Amino acid sequence: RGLELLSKWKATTGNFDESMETVKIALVGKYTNLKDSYLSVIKALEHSSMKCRRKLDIKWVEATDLEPEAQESNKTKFHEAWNMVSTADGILIPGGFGVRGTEGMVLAARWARENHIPFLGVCLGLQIATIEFTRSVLGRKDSHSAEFYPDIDEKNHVVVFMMRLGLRPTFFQNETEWSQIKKLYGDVSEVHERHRHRYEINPKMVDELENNGLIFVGKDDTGKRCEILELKNHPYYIATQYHPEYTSKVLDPSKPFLGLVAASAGILQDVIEGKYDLEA
């Protein structure tokens, strides 16, 4: 197992030197200038990009520069932000801190829902995948995070302090054999993942979202908590309430990020079928 780990390291290293073609990903969030604040997300994209043999090019987008208000306030940076979103082969909403970036992150999720761009939402990214699908597929234009507390009736989320932390399981919903993400997990019955959330999607709404096609393909032990979503019949539109970048490893890339790179490369089928494992 020592010699095999070296051989597999020489393989992932060779797959970086032997990398012929680029994948461009827009990472859209608060204060992306502070690049160490997203360090795990970058490394999770790197580990997966060496499995796909493709060169990674993260475009850093400040989420607030996408806003319709930014166009009069700071027009130049607003065009740079939108060129990055328009160029990218995939979109990534990375699980930001606090509310500020939300309005632009909605428009980045809309951009990948409508036009078939590959997408991953992490934590606040699932929250914003659900706020957007509510705000555009159900109408409901007033809907917002539970952070906007005094609106009450239109809160898209509910408090669940138990903060939920550490390695907890997540179980696939037993009918979802079509799912792109539960295929990447090798058809295993459950997964185990890290969490950092005080809010979850309001269970009252989840039947409406499931019936409209925002299928919650994974839930917790109780079945009350929204842990994964996949939009039915889109090339790759995933979100996770957990942070999968806290279990990405260089020889075993975290599956939600592997799917984002592989679909951005247009190769997702063949990665699932096994054309890119390190040893035969």
Q: Which residues are catalytic?
A: 123, 243, 245
Using CB under 8 A as the binding rule, whether residue 177 contacts a second copy is answered as no
Site for a second copy in 193-212 (CB under 8 A): none
Per DSSP (E only), the strands in the chain are 22-29, 55-62, 90-93, 119-122, 157-159, 164-165, 168-172, 190-193, 196-197, 199-201, 214-219, 226-231, 237-240
Cα(93)–Cα(202) distance, integer angstroms: 20
Is the distance from CB of 240 to CB of 168 less than 8 angstroms? no
Using CB under 8 A as the binding rule, whether residue 213 contacts a second copy is answered as no
Residue 71 CB, shortest distance to a second copy, in Å, is 5
Residue 94 CB, shortest distance to a second copy, in Å, is 21
Closest among 125, 145, 146 to 135, alpha carbons compared:
145
The Cβ of residue 187 has, within 10 Å, a number of other Cβ atoms equal to 9
Using CB under 8 A as the binding rule, whether residue 33 contacts a second copy is answered as no
Residue 166 CB, shortest distance to a second copy, in Å, is 39
Build a one-symbol-per-residue string for 63-82: x at contacts with a second copy by CB under 8 A, - elsewhere.
-----x--xx-----xx--x
Using CB under 8 A as the binding rule, whether residue 235 contacts a second copy is answered as yes
Using CB under 8 A as the binding rule, whether residue 114 contacts a second copy is answered as yes
Structure tokens at 8: 């597999």
Among 115, 211, 222, 233, binds a second copy (CB under 8 A): 115
Residue with tokens 């475009």: 59
What residues make contact with a second copy under the rule CB under 8 A? 68, 71-72, 78-79, 82-83, 85-87, 114-117, 139, 235
